[PDB]
């Protein structure tokens, strides 16, 4: 209905750096879109984010059993679940699939855009460079950015703004943590 | 490198709905089906290399409901402001006629987590193998959702995604053509 | 292996 809505959120964030070397646990509580009380593993107890959550921080901090239970979360909770799925989350590798095709911005009689499509790769950290006739084209390149598919794959459409001429040989080079060597795809005009 | 594993929860009133899910670097590892009271792994292979049978996850959402009622009173019954989504339609891979593909409808930056999403081929609703993810959490504490439609590319078919939201005046449509 | 649950705390 047109009735008002009220949203409560809880986020148990585990932040990992250098694997399990530096870990940080955040027990965060939210009302609608705003956080009102937080347990930072760096501090050691609950601290209000807004004045709305001050009763929650004071009430929880006065209970010694609770704080000691959350202070262990870096070892008992964060580091545990990190290693439970490390083999298929941190170490998950999927090969990309690069295809190149021309296109046009405006309805015209010739192509003015050339698209390089990298699809279905994990993790998402990737590098895509454009080359025309061996010389890399830095100017006139418009990237799409990383796109989360929601099914543990990524994609991005880095495209080169150029009117391709007959005889020119374009190449799209991609380097991804899953590839042992740079991957190239050529497109002759 | 840097990794984040967030255990996200919410409870929504008066809808009395809530969900419980884990997240690794933005992707859902699994979620708890509040109706069947079981773990639903986002990728089927996770259910063989991991395990999670938590009756207390339901108890977590029960606590969230109780905490929500107290916070609602604390805020003088301040309701949540509707944040309209930003709908986008894209394909799984590049389009090739007579080569199957997937059409993704990415609903992003919206709250509360309640939406009505439908696929429209030539204005006619479609529901053949349609799929969707749960409400995924964001860094700005808004939500995002995915909808999936396997299809055979053709020039006669024109598709649309109709996403209705309380922050939207009219049902938002985003078209995709070949 | 097997994911823990982090208990959400109740308030008064």
């Amino acid at each position, epitope marked *: 209905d047109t009735r008002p809505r009220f949203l409560e959120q809880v986020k148990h964030e585990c932040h990992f750096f250098n694997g399990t070397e530096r870990v940080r646990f955040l027990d965060r509580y939210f009302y609608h879109q705003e956080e009102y009380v937080r347990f930072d593993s760096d501090v050691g107890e609950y601290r209000a984010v807004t004045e709305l959550g001050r009763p929650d921080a004071e009430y929880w901090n006065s209970q010694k059993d609770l704080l*000691e239970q959350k202070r262990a979360a870096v*070892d008992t909770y964060c580091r545990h679940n990190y290693g439970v799925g490390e083999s298929f989350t941190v170490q998950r590798r999927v090969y990309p699939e690069v295809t190149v095709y021309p296109a046009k911005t405006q309805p015209l009689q010739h192509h003015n855009l050339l698209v390089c499509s990298v699809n279905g790769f994990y993790p998402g950290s990737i590098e895509v460079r454009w080359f025309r006739n061996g010389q890399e084209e830095k100017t006139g390149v418009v990237s799409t950015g990383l796109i989360q598919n929601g099914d543990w794959t990524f994609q991005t459409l880095v495209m080169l703004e150029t009117v391709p001429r007959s005889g020119e040989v374009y190449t799209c080079q991609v380097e991804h943590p899953s590839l042992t060597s740079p991957l190239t795809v050529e497109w002759r005009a | 490198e840097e990794h984040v594993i967030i255990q996200a929860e919410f409870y929504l009133n008066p809808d009395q709905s809530g969900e419980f899910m884990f997240d690794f670097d933005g992707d859902e590892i699994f979620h708890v089906d509040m109706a069947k009271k079981e773990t639903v792994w986002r990728l089927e292979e996770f259910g063989r290399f991991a395990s999670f*049978e*938590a*009756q*207390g996850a*339901l*108890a977590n959402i029960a606590v969230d409901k109780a905490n929500l009622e107290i916070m609602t009173k604390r805020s003088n019954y301040t309701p949540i402001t509707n944040v309209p989504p930003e709908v986008t339609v894209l394909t799984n891979s590049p389009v090739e006629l007579r080569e199957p593909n997937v059409l993704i409808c990415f609903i992003d930056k919206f709250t509360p987590p309640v939406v009505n999403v439908t696929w429209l081929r030539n204005g006619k609703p479609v529901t053949t193998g349609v799929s969707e993810t749960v409400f995924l959490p964001r860094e700005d504490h808004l939500f995002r959702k995915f909808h999936y439609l396997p299809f055979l590319p053709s020039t006669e078919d024109v598709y649309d995604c109709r996403v209705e939201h309380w922050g939207l005046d009219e049902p938002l449509l985003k078209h995709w053509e070949f | 292996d097997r994911y823990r649950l982090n208990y959400s705390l109740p308030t008064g």
Partner: T-cell receptor
Amino acid sequence: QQLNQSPQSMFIQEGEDVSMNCTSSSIFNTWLWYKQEPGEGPVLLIALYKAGELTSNGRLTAQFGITRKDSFLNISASIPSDVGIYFCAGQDVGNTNAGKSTFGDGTTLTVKP
Amino acid sequence: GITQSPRYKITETGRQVTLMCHQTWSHSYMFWYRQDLGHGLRLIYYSAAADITDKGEVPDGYVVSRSKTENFPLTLESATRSQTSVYFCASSGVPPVQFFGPGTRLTVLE
């Protein structure tokens, strides 16, 4: 019996010291110690949530074994009021997900005066 | 506070009796145990939250219900003489720590 509580029967003259053991068949994350007075229900004595912790509560002191599978409780300067059963509880990952605690069989302490 | 009722109970064989456990702490978790000689505490049933129930070590011969966060009624279906025990009820706001009740001494007689 996923939790082995030894000993189960003790006879301690006043002033002497008591030490109870408790071993786990799975890696534990928390340990609980209870005491059941005759005719009453078991109540909580000490809780330990960190490995190698050594928490005290008067003459009671309890240790969280670094094996994540052992736990001890000591009662210094035994008085006759310390009679009763002492339970040892804990949680593994499965327990934490279910919100339950596995209990040991217990130790029946009889302090003679 | 967790409280039990009845505290003592003599029932006949084959009859249906239901022991009640009431808590005002608004705790989410509740538990029903039975303490005998040589077995210690043994979980019969328990409830993570309202409208949620699961079985424990000794769930045969018993049923349970939890339609509210206050009451967790343990119910013997058909009273057997093997069910003569001391029944304890516990609760938890945030586990593992539990708060037990005074207990109930049930005696099933022919």
